[PDB]
Amino acid sequence: QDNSRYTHFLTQHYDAKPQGRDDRYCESIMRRRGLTSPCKDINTFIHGNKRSIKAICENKNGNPHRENLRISKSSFQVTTCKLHGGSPWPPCQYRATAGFRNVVVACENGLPVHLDQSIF
């Protein structure tokens, strides 16, 4: 069961099936996930199956990384939304960068609670 941080993690970084992996996608999703007041500078969404993400917390799909993080063994489709411009207030324009690679997360009680966005 989903503690607040894991739930928060999903709201901010998980979109099972994104309708688009483009700029408009970012503009829409950042808004729906309430990441636009103020505009979040950069935010990556992981797509695909939630269990694979959870699995990064076990050796099943992850390895230790750094001194408190885990990096996935598998690659995920991801979409990074980067704020375009300077205004921290809506409308938040975003440039989307679609990629496919493993991800780094922090796990707590076997659940991903933090996405290291420094690799995007």
Binding region for tRNA: 21-22, 81, 103
Instruction: Determine which one of 8, 65, 84, 114 is catalytic.
Output: 114
* Cβ(55)–Cβ(84) below 8 Å: no
| Residue 96 amino acid letter | A
Beta strands in 1-120 (DSSP E): 42-46, 62-65, 69-72, 76-84, 93-101, 104-108, 111-115
Active site residue 114: yes
> In whole angstroms, what is the distance from residue 69 CA to residue 60 CA?
15
Active site residue 65: no
**Binding residue ranges:** 21-22, 81, 103
Instruction: Determine which one of 13, 47, 65, 84 is catalytic.
Output: 13
For residue 1, give every residue at least 6 positions away whose Cβ sits within 8 Å of its Cβ, in sequence order, or none: none
* Catalytic site positions: 13, 114
